[PDB]
Amino acid sequence: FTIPVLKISEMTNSRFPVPVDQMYTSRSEGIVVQPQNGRATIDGELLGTTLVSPVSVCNFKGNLQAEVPGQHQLYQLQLTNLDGSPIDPTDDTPGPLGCPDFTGLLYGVASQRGPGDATRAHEARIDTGSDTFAPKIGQVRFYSTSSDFETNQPTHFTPIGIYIEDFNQWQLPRYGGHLANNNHLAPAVSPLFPGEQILFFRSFIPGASGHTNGEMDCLLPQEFVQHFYQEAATARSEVALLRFVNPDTGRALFESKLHKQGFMTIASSGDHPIIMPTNGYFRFEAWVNQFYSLAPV
Amino acid sequence: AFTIPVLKISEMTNSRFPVPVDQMYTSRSEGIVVQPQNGRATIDGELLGTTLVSPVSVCNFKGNLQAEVHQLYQLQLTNLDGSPIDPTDDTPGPLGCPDFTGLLYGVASQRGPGDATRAHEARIDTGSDTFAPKIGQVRFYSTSSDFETNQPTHFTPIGIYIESDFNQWQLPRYGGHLANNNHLAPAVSPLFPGEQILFFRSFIPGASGHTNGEMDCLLPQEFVQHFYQEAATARSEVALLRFVNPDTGRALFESKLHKQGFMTIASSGDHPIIMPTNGYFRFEAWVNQFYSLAPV
């Protein structure tokens, strides 16, 4: 079994198409950690709405069906899957792969190519928390400060950041609209062993407006998802022991438990970033059980 | 031991622009020098040009909003990973720097003071005289004046703006109009008769005007990452590959993966290489540059 050699700064966030900024740990007090993107067993089984492509999460693609009545510069998208295939509500997923897994005002740019090679693009916002947001059945709407959009022309939404007018990275959206309950969701995760906390790979996504640190925590960097999908090595135990080492010194910095279901934990207490030498990276050490005792920090 | 990751064309990421690969494509490249700087990696694991491993960083910019030169701003670039720009590096420019000339359309965002944020459309003319990323000098025009001076700023790429036109094979002057490029990954071309380079093409978004946004890269970003990661020794100058249909069982065609980091096939003319969706490349054997490939 193996994990690719990568510095924190070479990692890609698996919940938003941007690099990882830092490792971070938390008590996650009063919160259910149940992301749907960046979900993969160390076995190579992708969960939730997780796809392998690292530049597709939070992107949308589909036909510009029409403009909603009354509301201006608010457009209705008829989604296809990001790879072009038609949206299939019968799939055993909460929603289309790469679909945002948080509630908030997603800021981005909607572009079109057509008729012919004619193109146009403008800022756009999609409220993943709005009642009408129903990507599971292909119904998604975006607001734009421009009316320069063609009806029935291929359209794509490129994500950028969050717009604050609120952004809740742990609040799952209703993939099927206000009249449907989510299903097929990757399970929530949490540390079960005393003194441990989940280790997150955090990024500060861009803010388009208002106040926000745009904190976005994912359980595994996208590269680990791709590697597990690719290797499909058998999990010899429920926990793969990793050890963060500093190639510069030869010094190892701390150990972490990579759980079979796809998340890491460390022996730590409180909400704080895990600051380490820039060239540090994780390496597989051995197979242990969930009772393995880790030294703090 | 050499290997290439199992991937469908639709699972591949373009190495010159942060978007998925749309299709394989081949060309005579008539009257054109193929010398991209991004997506450059020897099958040995040696990264060339301005190539980085991160798949979401190419064509992005980061730095301080130094000042206004009307709604034209001067950036004081840092490397994408935060480290200061170092012109002494043996690279043409900072890693991930665009390797084409044109009007790059995107969005410039800021966070600061405190957790205050703001973002607006922005354009960077990688062909403009002032464009000098090798020394950290880059400017962006925005239809908004809502930008803070001396606040961390980031440029997220999106597409091309057509008004100076997009030329995917014209390298920008990384050091500004008063300096010549250097440390450039070498140009590549097919040397064997009847062969042409096999490109991994994507249609990047158009922000305005007419354009198919064709962007051809020599290797999908995943192969760059894999070679960087494996660093397996090249037993010969050419790694023979086969594109197989897992559905059926048999080969569709063969391609030669050159040690320097580019592929060629036996083909003639400019056209897309259309194959069954589940098809993917696999390493077959080590051959020399004289290996004869069957057409198509």
Side-chain angles (χ1 to χ4, degrees), chain A residues 1 189 230 237 272:
Chain A
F1 184 78
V189 296
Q230 200 65 228
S237 67
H272 50 274

mmCIF file with all atom_site columns, all heavy atoms in Angstrom, chain A residues 1 189 230 237 272:
data_model
loop_
_atom_site.group_PDB
_atom_site.id
_atom_site.type_symbol
_atom_site.label_atom_id
_atom_site.label_alt_id
_atom_site.label_comp_id
_atom_site.label_asym_id
_atom_site.label_entity_id
_atom_site.label_seq_id
_atom_site.pdbx_PDB_ins_code
_atom_site.Cartn_x
_atom_site.Cartn_y
_atom_site.Cartn_z
_atom_site.occupancy
_atom_site.B_iso_or_equiv
_atom_site.pdbx_formal_charge
_atom_site.auth_seq_id
_atom_site.auth_comp_id
_atom_site.auth_asym_id
_atom_site.auth_atom_id
_atom_site.pdbx_PDB_model_num
ATOM 1  N N   . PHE A 1 1   ? 0.886   -1.202 0.000   1.00 0.00 ? 1   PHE A N   1
ATOM 2  C CA  . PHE A 1 1   ? 0.000   0.000  0.000   1.00 0.00 ? 1   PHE A CA  1
ATOM 3  C C   . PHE A 1 1   ? 0.894   1.212  0.000   1.00 0.00 ? 1   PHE A C   1
ATOM 4  O O   . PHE A 1 1   ? 1.980   1.189  0.570   1.00 0.00 ? 1   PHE A O   1
ATOM 5  C CB  . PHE A 1 1   ? -0.871  0.042  1.250   1.00 0.00 ? 1   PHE A CB  1
ATOM 6  C CG  . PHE A 1 1   ? -1.853  1.189  1.268   1.00 0.00 ? 1   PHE A CG  1
ATOM 7  C CD1 . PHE A 1 1   ? -3.021  1.133  0.519   1.00 0.00 ? 1   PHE A CD1 1
ATOM 8  C CD2 . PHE A 1 1   ? -1.601  2.325  2.025   1.00 0.00 ? 1   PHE A CD2 1
ATOM 9  C CE1 . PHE A 1 1   ? -3.928  2.184  0.517   1.00 0.00 ? 1   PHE A CE1 1
ATOM 10 C CE2 . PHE A 1 1   ? -2.503  3.389  2.031   1.00 0.00 ? 1   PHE A CE2 1
ATOM 11 C CZ  . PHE A 1 1   ? -3.672  3.314  1.272   1.00 0.00 ? 1   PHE A CZ  1
ATOM 12 N N   . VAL A 1 189 ? -18.435 11.375 9.577   1.00 0.00 ? 189 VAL A N   1
ATOM 13 C CA  . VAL A 1 189 ? -17.260 10.785 10.201  1.00 0.00 ? 189 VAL A CA  1
ATOM 14 C C   . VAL A 1 189 ? -16.937 11.552 11.463  1.00 0.00 ? 189 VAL A C   1
ATOM 15 O O   . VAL A 1 189 ? -17.318 12.705 11.599  1.00 0.00 ? 189 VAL A O   1
ATOM 16 C CB  . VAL A 1 189 ? -16.022 10.813 9.270   1.00 0.00 ? 189 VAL A CB  1
ATOM 17 C CG1 . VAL A 1 189 ? -16.275 9.954  8.036   1.00 0.00 ? 189 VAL A CG1 1
ATOM 18 C CG2 . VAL A 1 189 ? -15.702 12.248 8.871   1.00 0.00 ? 189 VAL A CG2 1
ATOM 19 N N   . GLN A 1 230 ? -7.001  4.728  -8.288  1.00 0.00 ? 230 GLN A N   1
ATOM 20 C CA  . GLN A 1 230 ? -6.069  4.114  -9.211  1.00 0.00 ? 230 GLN A CA  1
ATOM 21 C C   . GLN A 1 230 ? -5.440  2.813  -8.724  1.00 0.00 ? 230 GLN A C   1
ATOM 22 O O   . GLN A 1 230 ? -5.372  1.842  -9.475  1.00 0.00 ? 230 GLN A O   1
ATOM 23 C CB  . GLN A 1 230 ? -4.967  5.118  -9.551  1.00 0.00 ? 230 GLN A CB  1
ATOM 24 C CG  . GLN A 1 230 ? -4.232  4.807  -10.829 1.00 0.00 ? 230 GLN A CG  1
ATOM 25 C CD  . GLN A 1 230 ? -5.131  4.901  -12.043 1.00 0.00 ? 230 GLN A CD  1
ATOM 26 O OE1 . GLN A 1 230 ? -5.144  3.999  -12.875 1.00 0.00 ? 230 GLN A OE1 1
ATOM 27 N NE2 . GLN A 1 230 ? -5.883  5.992  -12.152 1.00 0.00 ? 230 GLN A NE2 1
ATOM 28 N N   . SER A 1 237 ? -5.971  -3.709 7.251   1.00 0.00 ? 237 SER A N   1
ATOM 29 C CA  . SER A 1 237 ? -6.590  -3.468 8.545   1.00 0.00 ? 237 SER A CA  1
ATOM 30 C C   . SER A 1 237 ? -7.485  -2.257 8.384   1.00 0.00 ? 237 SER A C   1
ATOM 31 O O   . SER A 1 237 ? -7.617  -1.716 7.276   1.00 0.00 ? 237 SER A O   1
ATOM 32 C CB  . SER A 1 237 ? -5.535  -3.221 9.640   1.00 0.00 ? 237 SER A CB  1
ATOM 33 O OG  . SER A 1 237 ? -4.825  -2.015 9.452   1.00 0.00 ? 237 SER A OG  1
ATOM 34 N N   . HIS A 1 272 ? -7.001  24.384 15.772  1.00 0.00 ? 272 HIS A N   1
ATOM 35 C CA  . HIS A 1 272 ? -5.795  25.094 15.380  1.00 0.00 ? 272 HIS A CA  1
ATOM 36 C C   . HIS A 1 272 ? -5.146  24.476 14.149  1.00 0.00 ? 272 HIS A C   1
ATOM 37 O O   . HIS A 1 272 ? -5.325  23.290 13.868  1.00 0.00 ? 272 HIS A O   1
ATOM 38 C CB  . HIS A 1 272 ? -4.790  25.066 16.530  1.00 0.00 ? 272 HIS A CB  1
ATOM 39 C CG  . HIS A 1 272 ? -4.558  23.698 17.088  1.00 0.00 ? 272 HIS A CG  1
ATOM 40 N ND1 . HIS A 1 272 ? -5.361  23.146 18.064  1.00 0.00 ? 272 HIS A ND1 1
ATOM 41 C CD2 . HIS A 1 272 ? -3.642  22.749 16.775  1.00 0.00 ? 272 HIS A CD2 1
ATOM 42 C CE1 . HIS A 1 272 ? -4.949  21.919 18.329  1.00 0.00 ? 272 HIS A CE1 1
ATOM 43 N NE2 . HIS A 1 272 ? -3.910  21.653 17.559  1.00 0.00 ? 272 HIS A NE2 1
#
